């Protein structure tokens, strides 16, 4: 169901180390791929010990980017990525939507992760 067909991968891998026989990721990661035919760019970040946070969504889906909320939520579930953190003061101007709790709102609700549209 959700996320069916999503394909992509990290173009910028997070930094990593092995702690207690487990890999731990930290720093900035950039994932790029396709969802429903559209290009999607997702950035995550965390310090060592904090779960990765969704800090940027960029897509070429201009006509209905809200249709990406379900596959982004599923991608994030698979990855352990959270969407509670507010990046509104740390983001470049030009966001067209904001994602928080994996739901999308328009520019009058600037809280959470910015959603940029590029084509
Ligand atoms: C680079 N990776 C890989 N990875 C986790 O490992 C899964 C498989 O990643 P992969 O890109 O297929 O393999 P890869 O890490 O390149 O393996 P290898 O380099 O040993 O060949 C990913 O779906 C994800 O769960 C990651 N998870 C987080 N949070 N951040 C990251 O940068 C990365």
Numbering used by the authors: 1704 to 1822
Study text:
The L protein is a multifunctional enzyme catalyzing genome replication as well as viral transcription. As demonstrated for the influenza virus polymerase complex, the bunyavirus L protein is assumed to bind to cap structures of cellular mRNAs, while an endonuclease cleaves the mRNA some nucleotides downstream of the cap creating a short RNA fragment. This capped RNA fragment is subsequently used to prime viral transcription. Here we present the structure of a small globular domain located in the C-terminal region of RVFV L protein along with the first evidence for a functional cap-binding site within the bunyavirus L protein.
RVFV CBD crystallized as a dimer, which is not fully symmetric, with a buried surface area of ~430 Å2 between the monomers. In solution, the protein appears to be monomeric, as revealed by size-exclusion chromatography (S4 Fig, buffer composition: 50 mM Na-phosphate, pH 6.5, 150 mM NaCl, 10% (w/v) glycerol). The structure of RVFV CBD consists of a β-sheet formed by seven β-strands, an additional β-hairpin as well as a long α-helix. Thus, m7GTP was present in all crystallization setups and additional electron density corresponding to an m7GTP ligand was indeed clearly visible in both chains of the RVFV CBD structure. The m7GTP molecule was bound in a small, mainly hydrophobic pocket between two aromatic amino acid side chains, F1713 and Y1728. The phosphate moiety of the cap structure interacts with R1716 side chain, which is extending from the loop between the first β-strand and the β-hairpin. Further contacts with the m7GTP involve M1782, interacting with the guanine moiety and ribose of the cap-structure, as well as Q1717, interacting with the guanine moiety. Isothermal titration calorimetry (ITC) measurements revealed a KD of ~737 μM of RVFV CBD for m7GTP, which is considerably higher than the KD of 1.5 μM reported for m7GTP binding to influenza virus PB2. In summary, changes of the chemical properties of side chains directly interacting with m7GTP in the RVFV CBD structure mostly result in selective transcription defects in the context of the full-length L protein. The binding site topology of the RVFV L protein cap-binding domain, however, is different from the PB2 cap-binding site: The corresponding essential aromatic residue from the end of the long α-helix (α1) in PB2 (F404) is absent in the RVFV structure.
